């Protein structure tokens, strides 16, 4: 079971970002609920930003013109078409730019989960290159939770890890 570098997990259902483990006591998936909630807060504000900007106060009810008011009719048509072209442009461009930034945002955040793990494990685990780390020391459920919580006690497992490393 490889991580983010090869593809996603269909076995992880409680958040967008998270962890998977295999240990003596068992295995499974669990979400990183703080990285996921912060990502959600960001995305929710982004969705609302799109909604708030596109505020329509425009009246499109048309007007009739006479046979001798063609210049006015054509000016009115030009105005309606010009505003439509501009708003169509703005709506499409805003959505494409935001979709691209959103995908980069999420890719950045999964990378950050990876980096905050190697910054704790350091030489106590082998970085594999498939989005996972192999602890040199034997690790139980309590140290797995400790790494996920950002509280890993590196010194505590340093001697065992060195011997195996």
């Amino acid at each position, epitope marked *: 079971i490889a991580g983010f570098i090869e593809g996603g997990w269909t076995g992880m*259902v*409680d*958040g967008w970002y998270g962890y998977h483990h295999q240990n003596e006591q068992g295995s499974g998936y669990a979400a990183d*609920q703080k990285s996921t909630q912060n990502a959600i*807060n960001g995305i929710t504000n982004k969705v*609302n930003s799109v*909604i*708030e900007k596109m505020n329509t106060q425009f009246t499109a009810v048309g007007k009739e013109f006479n046979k001798l008011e063609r210049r006015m009719e054509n000016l009115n048509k030009k105005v309606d078409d010009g505003f439509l072209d501009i708003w169509t442009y703005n709506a499409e461009l805003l959505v494409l730019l935001e979709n691209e930034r959103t995908l980069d945002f999420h890719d950045s955040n999964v990378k950050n989960l990876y980096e905050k793990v190697k910054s704790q494990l350091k030489n106590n685990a082998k970085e594999i290159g498939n989005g996972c780390f192999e602890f040199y020391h034997k690790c139980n459920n309590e140290c797995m939770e400790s790494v996920k919580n950002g509280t890993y006690d590196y010194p505590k497992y340093s001697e065992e890890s060195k011997l195996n490393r």
Partner: antibody
Framework: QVQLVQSGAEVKKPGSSVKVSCTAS????????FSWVRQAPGQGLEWMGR???????DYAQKFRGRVTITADKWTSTVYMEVTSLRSEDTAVYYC??????????????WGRGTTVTV | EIVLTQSPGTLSLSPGERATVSCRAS???????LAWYQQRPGQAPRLLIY???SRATGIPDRFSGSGSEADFTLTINRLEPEDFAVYYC?????????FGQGTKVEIK
């Protein structure tokens, strides 16, 4: 932080429908997920259904076909209509919103609730 | 469906004493989808714990909880006069969302 405001109490005769509502304030209505929860006198809480105005809706199966839950972003208000009322429908109906169950999380903002008598 | 059974229906203790409320699901449920609520008579439910264990904003250190699979517990240390209320077990993992009966705490 959202401040939900609810409508007053209702008294109905059997067979009629009741519409109750919650007004959201202090945030953007469209992305809040609004749940309706009922509590019969002397009983525990029961979930009836949920609306995410910009995304979709779901219902408790017991009320599917009797309860319609809708929303109006223009007045920031969520409505629930319960049809074919029966004498067991004497519960207090509350709104609550989730923290983030746009996608994944629990209910942490609650309104005061409105009593419906049948 | 996911069915939540709470126990005891009524818990009774001296103020300052520790209370626990048990909840058992009909099926195993990922802990991310559990929550606990406190309903003081005359009031709408307040969120205490979200997920099996995280405490909600504005809720004091007296409250904590944990569990796994189908078995979860709410812990209230040093229970105070304002905590003699009814606690509810709720899960949002699948539709329909489900609630337990509620556990009342009495003053003795």
């Amino acid at each position: 932080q959202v401040q939900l405001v609810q409508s007053g109490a209702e008294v109905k005769k059997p067979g009629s429908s009741v519409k109750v509502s919650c007004t959201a304030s202090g945030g953007t209505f469209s992305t809040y997920q609004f749940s309706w929860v009922r509590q019969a006198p002397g009983q525990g809480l029961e979930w009836m259904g949920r609306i995410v105005p910009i995304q979709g809706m779901d219902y408790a199966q017991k009320f599917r076909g009797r309860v319609t839950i809708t929303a109006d972003k223009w007045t920031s208000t969520v409505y629930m209509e319960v049809t074919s009322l029966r004498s067991e429908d004497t519960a207090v109906y509350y709104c609550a919103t989730s923290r983030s169950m746009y996608f994944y999380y629990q209910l942490d903002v609650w309104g005061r609730g409105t009593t419906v008598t049948v | 469906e996911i069915v939540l059974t709470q126990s005891p229906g009524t818990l009774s203790l001296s103020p300052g004493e520790r209370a626990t409320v048990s909840c058992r699901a009909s099926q195993s449920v990922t802990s991310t989808f559990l929550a606990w609520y406190q309903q003081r008579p005359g009031q709408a439910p307040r969120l205490l714990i979200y997920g099996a264990s995280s405490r909600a904003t504005g809720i004091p250190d007296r409250f904590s909880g944990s569990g796994s699979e189908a078995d979860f517990t709410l812990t209230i240390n040093r229970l105070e006069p304002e905590d003699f209320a009814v606690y509810y077990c709720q899960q949002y993992a699948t539709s329909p969302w489900t609630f337990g009966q509620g556990t009342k705490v009495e003053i003795k």
